């Protein structure tokens, strides 16, 4: 529980990015100088502490543990205002360090920017909420920076690691007890162009050094190393960190490559190998083009005192030599098997010398080939290896095993093989086998033609497969001499690390079909090593390289799946109740991430079924899909950019019920139960007799016309039932992008709105009838949805038959992820060979409605112990990128049983916020009619192409409806539909996000990969206005900044109408009755004429006399305490009513929240004299409130009191009402003592007291008296309210009071306006029972409060109350 005090200061240096701290006087530098960074100091800023050899620009690590309050003294020294902003802490408004309009007072604006040469102090209390849980690494790593100017401060330096660990796991010096060494790395992309001194620069660095020249990291042998990898970049950049020859453990997954996104952080294991020096690099092709490397040195330390654990079995069982002969060979290859060319390339040329059309494409690749004999004299290997194209033979390696690799280069250029993630185990030590590795342990002889040599690979007990992992892991292998132009060449491979023990080089399990190799390789022929002979010699053109391309650099590059273009890959085939093993890998020099989608089928990923998978460059990912829905489907890439879109693999799914036939085609197999071992000609007949799914469906009968009830009949074969009917339609409306931030709310970059921000686009709108004649108005729950369509929700095992009617000018359809469905209910129109009866769902014509029947099942539900609900999405699928853009998109939520109300399907457990972090390229949208356009000067001038309106739900700034209470669990359904090379790192200011499930991981920010629908849980920390934003600077500066509001926990306070705060003139009504004035209606109790009534109730509608309450200030109101008024055996009360709210007196909105009607009809009060309390489920913010009765007993008559809290601040009783403020805290000078009155003691002044109420009194009745409030700590006091005392056959109260406040209790600093040193006179009260509320223009941030009754009517009396919250 120790307090950790750190000292930092942002100071200027002269950095050169070169490895040298001091090597020579003269400097030859890549263009950058004079940056600013902050470094740690000794206490009281004596002199700078020595910096580590590794951390050049990386700041000091501010280590801490939960329960430790850390104070950072920030004495700025650079010549620019700056600040420090954390990332994963429940920091307050005084230590946030971020400058936006939070409507906070000037006392709390000092943290946003400190002037140079002026000090401050940052306090970040760490609690159990923002700390590591079980199943979580001991130390969580975050990054803190300067929030004054995120674009300019980062690029000029100003970065620091931030570790928050568990309890008792941190030493005095900040080192974990269990880990021998901890190393902090910063893969940052510094840009000196957007810096203090603009010099053209794009250097790619680790820590503060460029070109992989950071000094080597020296570690001992077989050591436990904990890594803290940070990645930051001003623009969207992706880091794919790879530890060559090593394996790490990240989030209970043993992986060789760690993937990071800009402005993120990660921690992981590492167990070091015996000897030798390795290298770590980045697998991103543009990152590998530059250096971005670090060298890790492993030296056998004699003084290490190695335990010699020797944890190994070394017993003959479960191991075999498994010799593999993979001698590479130079071949000719056809990227497009246009003519039926099968079984690889035994026959070589058959060439027409034309790149297009028939064979003769002549893309001369060097692929790996498998042999069987020592001398390689005969090929000797020819498995049925069709549809496995340019791929090295697959190596299946068990745990504990070893294997042998032999090459014989039959090409001209020397080549090699690099086991990527295959020498993951500590590579066997060598003395001469290094083969001039270049001091990197990289075994590359670069085998010459007619040369042969052998590699040794192995594995220890600790292995990449883990308990929470797939059966077999995927890891590729390639060459090292030139990565780009050999990946562009045929030197490609893929091998598996199978945890399953029973493989024996025959097969893993002959019950799961193995469609092992599906590799999206992008071979760039313009980068091919054999370009000169290929391109020129075999065309009707002269001899020029011609790499400047009108088309060539785009025409020659071909995206293929296993070396075959998807336009000529024959359809696949798997039968019913079959498991299929898929091993994907993105290896082509695309530099862009790739996502894939299974139509009608879902994976198993961890313990989730994801239905969509994202691929990173040179990282292997393996999933297993089980066939469940009959018919034909496909795999497709959802990136769907005009570059590299057509990547589709069509696979069938048939009931393979005729098991009597023995002849099963060997590969591409319908697998029998018994395990025997101890293009064209694929998806055709002689496959086990496959029943035509289009004429033998049991789910759908095609003899008669399609009926949704008939289809849902077979779906509802169980007791679940629960049909959920949704009537939805597509309508074209004029949409606002910036109308909420035109002149108010958050800052705007679209100054003066050069365009109207009123683009026309089509959206989803829900209806209640099948006639589509009446609309269902959007309530307050969904007012944050914006452009998103209605929330379609259902339970598990349910069937959702949805009726969709097109009301636009173009055909639109409806396609839903995750949920199971027939081909008769789908939105995608591909070549599925379907009849015309399955093609009526593909496109829905205007003025026509089609009913879709989806069946929620076990695959579409959340985990067993995980989050309650999980999110999918539905969108028009006639043309996706033209349909998700233009506004056709919506959320689809599925939850476990017993969570949604039957009549209205809304979960009552937790609030749900659906946010679609996507940007809308309006050029892609339809209705993009350009008139008098092209007036823009640059290609990035106007927001039609320069800015894609980076928005959260269609609104660039200040998305409304984001309201939640503090200390409240809310469920966040973060979505990202399709997209392309755009990963959003979602950051909530002052909040930490928990990833629920079977592991319970806690994060500060979440990188949102495209196509991922991640559901999280968040607990609000403190009230106020906090900023929701993506953490990338350049996308945040121009959008994605929604200030969301966190309300007080106790927002149930009388907003007036009973105490007397609301003036008599602030209340009006539509009609009268005679002496039943609207003035009397506000009072909750008392009075002979005590309420408001009218003559009679209307008939056609409410059309009822309303009553309006004025506030002169927007406040949060949560409920209303309505009651009747009975008098002389006559009773009257409002039985039913609805409430309308508005900020001004023009735009009136009727309240409807969680109600199965057009508007809410509150249940009213059954009998008079009984206070009935109602609650508004989302609290409403407004200034005027109109409540109008709809039904009542006899003549309507109403008394009303409003409950709520003040907005944009802490307005809660700090005490003085409940027992929170002890009697021993507060006191005063002198009390009146009388025998009959006993003691008129202090500490009895409380907001409401009765009997012998003791408000306050004085035994002298003079000017110098006061009442003192002694809070335990420094608190923020906002408002004070006074109410005098009881009549007591007299009339005693105060007229005017003056305030002095102090912290130590001796200073007594008066509170006054900036006029002069005279106490400000505060308004008193006239009523004996009335409450008069006084606000503070600056809030008194102090401990002690003195209030002095300067002006008094009689013996001084006072029953005060205080409001506010704790500071930290
Ligand atoms: C790190 O590795 C050890 C053993 O390999 C494992 O027990 C632990 O759970 C891993 N994760 C940590 C320490 O966060
Ligand atoms: C060194 O780094 C620069 C960027 O700062 C990069 O352009 C250059 O290619 C690197 N050097 C080599 C040999 O790749
Ligand atoms: C659809 O019907 C409406 C009549 O309600 C008609 O005005 C419209 O022209 C028709 N066609 C389209 C494409 O909306
Ligand atoms: C929401 O409405 C349902 C019925 O419409 C009701 O049972 C439930 O109590 C409501 N929830 C809240 C928080 O008012």
PDB file of C-alpha atoms in Angstrom, residues 17 154-155 159 186-192 194 201-207 230-239 262 286-287 292:
ATOM      1  CA  UNK A  17      18.512   7.922 -34.305  1.00  0.00           C
ATOM      2  CA  UNK A 154       4.185  11.803 -30.142  1.00  0.00           C
ATOM      3  CA  UNK A 155       6.208  12.325 -33.316  1.00  0.00           C
ATOM      4  CA  UNK A 159       6.451   8.268 -24.802  1.00  0.00           C
ATOM      5  CA  UNK A 186       8.867   0.247 -28.279  1.00  0.00           C
ATOM      6  CA  UNK A 187       8.157  -0.492 -31.943  1.00  0.00           C
ATOM      7  CA  UNK A 188       7.385   3.103 -32.901  1.00  0.00           C
ATOM      8  CA  UNK A 189       7.128   4.846 -36.263  1.00  0.00           C
ATOM      9  CA  UNK A 190       8.559   8.315 -35.670  1.00  0.00           C
ATOM     10  CA  UNK A 191       7.807  11.018 -38.249  1.00  0.00           C
ATOM     11  CA  UNK A 192       9.870  14.200 -38.005  1.00  0.00           C
ATOM     12  CA  UNK A 194       4.862  16.351 -38.156  1.00  0.00           C
ATOM     13  CA  UNK A 201      11.463  11.829 -42.395  1.00  0.00           C
ATOM     14  CA  UNK A 202       9.729   8.454 -42.244  1.00  0.00           C
ATOM     15  CA  UNK A 203      12.210   6.401 -40.212  1.00  0.00           C
ATOM     16  CA  UNK A 204      10.986   3.118 -38.724  1.00  0.00           C
ATOM     17  CA  UNK A 205      12.556   2.609 -35.306  1.00  0.00           C
ATOM     18  CA  UNK A 206      12.651   0.397 -32.240  1.00  0.00           C
ATOM     19  CA  UNK A 207      13.021   2.437 -29.035  1.00  0.00           C
ATOM     20  CA  UNK A 230       4.676  -1.305 -27.036  1.00  0.00           C
ATOM     21  CA  UNK A 231       3.641  -0.121 -30.472  1.00  0.00           C
ATOM     22  CA  UNK A 232       2.794   3.487 -31.306  1.00  0.00           C
ATOM     23  CA  UNK A 233       2.285   5.446 -34.522  1.00  0.00           C
ATOM     24  CA  UNK A 234       0.509   8.686 -35.387  1.00  0.00           C
ATOM     25  CA  UNK A 235      -1.185   7.117 -38.400  1.00  0.00           C
ATOM     26  CA  UNK A 236      -2.704   3.657 -38.753  1.00  0.00           C
ATOM     27  CA  UNK A 237       0.239   1.243 -38.664  1.00  0.00           C
ATOM     28  CA  UNK A 238       0.420  -2.469 -37.863  1.00  0.00           C
ATOM     29  CA  UNK A 239       3.375  -4.219 -36.220  1.00  0.00           C
ATOM     30  CA  UNK A 262      -0.662   1.463 -33.240  1.00  0.00           C
ATOM     31  CA  UNK A 286       6.839  -2.490 -45.519  1.00  0.00           C
ATOM     32  CA  UNK A 287       8.285  -2.869 -42.013  1.00  0.00           C
ATOM     33  CA  UNK A 292      13.037  -2.239 -37.394  1.00  0.00           C
TER      34      UNK A 292
END
